[PDB]
C-alpha cells in the first residue's frame, strides 16, 4: 500500500478509558492494570471491557495510523463511532458502530456480524490501519508482512465522527499483559 503519507498522530483519551487501564505519559500506550487504577467513573468509560479511544475525531479525508501488538495473545482494533454504547455488553459489528478486527484464541477475524475469519500467513507484530471516509473504507495492513492486506471494510455507514478504537484484551491466561503501543511516523 502508498497510505503512509495519511499518517496522523494518534494519542489515547484517559476520560473513555475502562478503570482498569494504564495509559502512559506520552498518551501512546495502553495496559491492562492488575487492579482498579483509582480513577472515578464517568460515563463515556467503556464498563465491561479494556476498551479506549483516541482523542481524535475524524469526519472528513484519510488517515492511517499503525499499532504495535508485540507479543499479545488477544485484542480488538479499528474505528469506532463517538456515539457507540459504553456501558454493558455489546458485539463489535458494523450495526453497533464498530469496524475492527481482532485476535482471539489464535484465529484472526474481522467484526462483522457474523464474524469473517481473516487468511494470515505472517502473525503480525504491528498493524496498519487506514481510513478513507468519503469513499466509505476502513483497511488493515500486515506491516510485519511489507504491508500486505488483511482486511478491507467498504460501503462503510459511518453515519457520524469517527474515533480510533482499541481493546487490550482481557488477561486470564497470563499471556496477554503486554501493552497496545501507537507507532512512530
Ligand atoms: C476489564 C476489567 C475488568 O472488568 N476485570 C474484571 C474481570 C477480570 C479482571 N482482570 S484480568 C483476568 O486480568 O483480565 C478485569
Known sequence: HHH???????????NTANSWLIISKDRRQVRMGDTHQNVSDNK????????????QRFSSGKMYWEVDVTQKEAWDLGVCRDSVQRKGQFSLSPENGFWTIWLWQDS?????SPQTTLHIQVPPCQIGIFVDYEAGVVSF????DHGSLIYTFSE???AGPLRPFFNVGFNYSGGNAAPLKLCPL
Open 156 to 158: 462503510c455507514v459511518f
Open 108 to 112: 484472526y477475524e474481522a467484526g462483522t
Open 44 to 55: 463515556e468509560r467503556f464498563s465491561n471491557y479494556p476498551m479506549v479511544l483516541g482523542a
Open 141 to 144: 495492513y500486515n506491516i510485519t
Open 4 to 14: 503512509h503519507h495519511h499518517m496522523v498522530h494518534i494519542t489515547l483519551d484517559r
